[PDB]
Scaffold this active site. Structure first.
Site, PDB file in Angstrom:
ATOM      1  N   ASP A   1       0.805  -1.219   0.000  1.00 53.36           N
ATOM      2  CA  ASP A   1       0.000   0.000   0.000  1.00 53.36           C
ATOM      3  C   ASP A   1       0.842   1.275   0.000  1.00 53.36           C
ATOM      4  O   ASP A   1       0.509   2.262  -0.671  1.00 53.36           O
ATOM      5  CB  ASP A   1      -0.962  -0.021   1.194  1.00 53.36           C
ATOM      6  CG  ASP A   1      -1.959  -1.193   1.137  1.00 53.36           C
ATOM      7  OD1 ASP A   1      -1.911  -2.001   0.195  1.00 53.36           O
ATOM      8  OD2 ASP A   1      -2.810  -1.310   2.036  1.00 53.36           O
TER       9      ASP A   1
ATOM     10  N   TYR B   1      -9.588  -1.492   1.252  1.00 51.57           N
ATOM     11  CA  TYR B   1      -9.207  -1.139   2.648  1.00 51.57           C
ATOM     12  C   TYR B   1      -9.160   0.352   2.881  1.00 51.57           C
ATOM     13  O   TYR B   1      -8.930   1.148   1.959  1.00 51.57           O
ATOM     14  CB  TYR B   1      -7.720  -1.547   2.961  1.00 51.57           C
TER      15      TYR B   1
END
Ligand SMILES: [Co+2]
Ligand SMILES: [Co+2]
Lengths: 620, 620
Positions: A290, A374
């Site tokens: 990420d 997410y």
């Protein structure tokens, strides 16, 4: 302001000009990353040189470049061509996100796949996921994205409820070719919707919650000066923001009476990986960095007052660059406020008759980001007693799959036919230590049990042992919750009044580290995640535990390479890298939207002060 | 009314009248313990039968008695004479505490020891501590307290700053005799004061803290009914209070739609031990069972609004018995309130364009106690998502000693010549489980790493394994932080919509357990503290992990004896006993008054609900 101030829209624009002017920003060029550089090591260096580092992509297929420019002196300090096959591909561009679905929509293999499943191609969303590096030789040097399909019945529908398993496509986002379409078999597409905003699913909303008002009638106790300099209850620091790391803390110091004592030079989450443990070929390549591949600061949310940040909030709106060098402001991207934190200290003494109670507080600096399914909240806390803490809050929608007929050892069931592949969210906090200055060292402290016998006849004795990590080759440590293992960072040349080196103790949560087989690709690419604590000698080019170009990098890039230098870390300018994460076996209660799960770590003063630093806190 | 209602003053006076009427409470008798018993197991309870259990001491030296009375029926259900040398002494009486200093003040051995140190006996405070069980044969069957001296220079002085090392005395508090005075040699008595309210030490008080006002305009969201029945955000429970255990939670259940689903029948901190790790004969016997020996509930502080409990607080003022059976109220001894708890769930979906954010909240039930130099806060939390958590907060003043001139492996230095012996604070949470009812089972869940190879060719797969604990003999478990070990309590007969047994997962902090040598007196007396988790088959007389009588009681009762029964716990009425604690190596920052240190555990739903239970939470 100081050389630590947040980048201005003007500096971003100035970087854009310098680049285009040097012929570095043509119509086929895209800025994949851009961020201000921190001042180099020194003290009496009043001559400010604001530099910016940029990664430039070329949509034609030409080799990308790493360029460092000086905004103060309108110059191009360096510009280098990158051999991505050697050093790794540049970060995934936000604009490439749509590309995977678009290219796939006209691929006959894909269309054939959708037709067999009776899925309307116009309803099939494709998640543009990082590729990693596996057995596809033709991918080396190429910028690849992989796509997993999710059906969206209508515009406001949550596609995560409808994964299309048994199907995966690989796409060369530069040449714009679908390099491959794998269809291992049709899996029923989960039919229930996961629309958490649909009254039929939520039921009548609760009317039982009465409001809780948190106000500061006289304003907050902290002061913000020079745009990002914070002063609060003896603490002093500068809140920076980088498109890759998000919120970064600079110059964390504590004013102990007369002195402003440094503690941490720079604190940041330098990487965050999400490895999946489903051995199905449809997902076995899935590992999302990420921070390294997607850049978390880029996707920071604009926080709404009263909703995201309650109480008396002071916002920072960081400015980043878009793909063309134009400055973009993330309005209300950072929250700053102080929170009550219960009891700080309390004692009712019989002998003296004195009853004493004091309340604690914490300064909070946070931001929330979204990376596809997410959503993560990053929170830094500074406490009255000198404690520093980090906490990550993981939420969003779980990444889904089909739940295998006959169950699974690597996927859990969330709804009829709906699965959630097991995965982890592993973080790396990079802490450039400055305990009373840069001359620091690290000791591993274990509780020591003692055997009953001479000197310990009652068998009640217990002790502690400290082992100094002297070289990088012995600074790759693992947790040991059983022996209460912690790591103390001290300054061997700064002693407290009892003549003991001042220090800070790192308390880890001791969660499991990377589970993947040691010989796996992810173990090699995210080797930092295999151990709890790393200590390296500082070097301005050693910024990330996974290296500068994570995307499709082959392995061993960051910490393993840095550590291999085996530098002296006993009383030197050092950096602590703490690995900490969550291991997830999704539950039915994580569906349709996940409630927050948290992880973190903290550092507490350990003989840093000469007595409690909170004796001057008023009765309140 | 509800059989779980708090004991009233009237009930306590009535128990006294019944005991008196039965000839069990003459003028030489003292109530060492009195508390209401929980309603018997089952459902068909033929009317109300409020029973109280009492431990009756005799100041003349006659054998004590354990008695159960039915305050409802005005009867004595049972009364048995106790052989204390075998089964243990009764808890320490508040009146016996002062006796130690009083008797020592006229003892010539004590006086000679004081004179040798040039100390004025009128300024020497004596900490009356539990004796434990060692090699002193003459102590068997006698009520002994050991005394450690601290100099108090003036009325408001903190004596803890001035420990008198090398000296200890043992006292029989019934016959009023000093049995032994041990002087191993003089140690300088630390001179520096630890007066945390002395402006000379605190320095000028901070003027920087601005107020943080927390209010509830429309009042709290929870309702208090029947004195102690709480209803809040789907949760339901009864808040009880026992003089030994403190706050006890009964009938914790969650209203899932139409049904009120039980989760935990009873939750309490059933024991807590504070063992010391200094091998000096002056302190090697030092271990207190604050719950079992002292009765933490009786020392609960009256909490001040604004200082101890901030916000809209609803207080309970539990009533306990004094030494004579008269009722005594602990005014504002229990705080109840709900507090904001950040973000509950959040997702900004690209595909749907829907941005969703919901805030979390937690119901808090707490009390703070003080026993000597230590003060402990016990906090229970209930979250919106179904999570249950306990948190202990340790503060007060560190128990001191002299700091050996040549340093120490078992004591740390706090100030010049002032030491702090190493110790632990270990708790035992007794959780009488009722996951959707009493048919429960416990599984130990470990993360499972998989080897790269056939079926896991990329080496990314990871799994989980669950082992059912079927008999008590296999129900004594230890932590394994490295493999993410947790314990799931499920109901094998109650399945969620996905046909999986509903359950709750226990997340421990994995702190070190009891460090003492296994052959030590404390390892035997605090056997429960040597392992992280124990599961027993419920029995109404199996209340404490250390047995009913801990004071000067050897091993032979408690968990080790219960477990030997090797009962079926696979789908039966079971009880989980979780050991969790802090290991303290005091720091200079802990002096002159310790900042709060915390430890606890939590239980999160694990397939209990059919989907997230917070979809009906409204937007802020
Ligand atoms: Co997750
Ligand atoms: Co302690």
């Amino acid at each position: 302001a100081s050389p630590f101030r947040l980048a201005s829209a003007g500096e971003i624009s100035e970087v854009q000009g310098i680049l285009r002017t040097a012929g570095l920003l043509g119509p086929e060029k895209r800025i994949a990353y851009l961020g201000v550089l921190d001042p180099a090591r020194g003290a009496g260096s009043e001559a400010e040189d604001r530099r910016f580092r940029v990664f430039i992509h070329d949509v034609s297929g030409a080799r990308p470049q790493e360029v460092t420019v000086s905004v103060t002196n309108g110059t191009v300090i360096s510009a280098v061509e990158l051999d991505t096959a050697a050093t790794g591909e540049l970060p995934v561009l936000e604009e490439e996100f749509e590309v995977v679905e678009q290219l796939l929509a006209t691929d006959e293999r894909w269309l054939k796949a959708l037709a067999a499943r009776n899925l309307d191609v116009s309803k099939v969303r494709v998640a543009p996921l990082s590729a990693g590096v596996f057995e596809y030789a033709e991918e080396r040097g190429r910028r690849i994205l992989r796509g997993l399909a999710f059906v969206q019945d209508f515009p406001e529908d949550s596609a995560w409820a409808h994964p299309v398993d048994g199907l995966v496509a690989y796409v060369d986002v530069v040449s714009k070719e679908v390099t491959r379409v794998i269809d291992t078999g049709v899996f029923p597409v989960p039919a229930e919707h996961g629309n958490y905003t649909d009254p039929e699913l939520t039921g009548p909303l609760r009317t039982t919650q009465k409001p809780i008002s948190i106000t500061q009638p006289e304003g907050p106790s902290f002061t913000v000066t020079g745009g990002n300099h914070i002063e609060w209850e003896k603490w002093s620091l500068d809140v920076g923001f980088d498109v890759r790391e998000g919120v970064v803390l600079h110059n964390i110091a504590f004013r102990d009476g007369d002195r402003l004592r440094p503690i941490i030079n720079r604190a940041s989450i330098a990487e965050m990986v999400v490895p999946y443990g489903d051995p199905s070929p449809i997902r076995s390549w899935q590992n999302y960095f990420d921070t390294g591949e997607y850049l978390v600061g880029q996707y920071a949310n604009s926080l709404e007052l009263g909703c995201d940040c309650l109480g008396d909030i002071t916002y920072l709106s960081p400015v980043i660059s878009d793909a063309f060098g134009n400055p973009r402001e993330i309005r209300n991207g950072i929250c700053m406020h102080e929170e009550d934190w219960g009891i700080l200290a309390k004692h009712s003494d019989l002998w003296s008759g004195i009853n004493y109670t004091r309340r604690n507080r914490r300064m909070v600096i946070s931001f929330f980001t979204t990376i596809g399914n997410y959503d993560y909240g990053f929170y830094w806390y500074l406490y009255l007693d000198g404690t520093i803490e980090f906490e990550a809050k993981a939420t969003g929608v779980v990444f889904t799959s089909a739940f295998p007929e006959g169950g699974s050892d690597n996927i859990s069931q969330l709804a009829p036919g709906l699965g959630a592949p097991f995965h982890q969210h592993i973080f790396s906090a990079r802490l450039d230590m400055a305990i009373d200055g840069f001359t620091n060292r690290v000791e591993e402290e274990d509780v020591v049990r003692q055997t009953m016998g001479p000197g310990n006849e009652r068998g009640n004795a217990f002790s502690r042992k400290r082992t100094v990590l002297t070289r990088e080759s012995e600074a790759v440590r693992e947790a040991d919750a059983r022996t209460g293992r912690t790591w103390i960072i001290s300054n061997p040349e700064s002693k407290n009044r009892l003549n003991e080196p001042v220090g800070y103790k790192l308390h880890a949560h001791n969660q499991p580290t990377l589970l993947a087989d040691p010989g796996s690709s992810i173990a090699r690419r995210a080797a930092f995640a295999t151990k709890d604590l790393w200590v390296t000698r500082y070097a301005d080019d050693e910024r990330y535990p996974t290296g500068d170009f994570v995307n499709q990098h082959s392995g061993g890039a960051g910490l393993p390479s840095y550590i291999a230098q085996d530098r002296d870390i006993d009383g030197q300018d050092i950096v602590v890298w703490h690995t900490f994460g969550l291991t997830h076996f999704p539950r039915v209660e994580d569906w349709p939207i996940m409630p927050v799960d948290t992880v973190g770590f903290k550092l507490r003063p350990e003989g840093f002060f000469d007595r409690s630093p909170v004796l001057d806190v008023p009765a309140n």
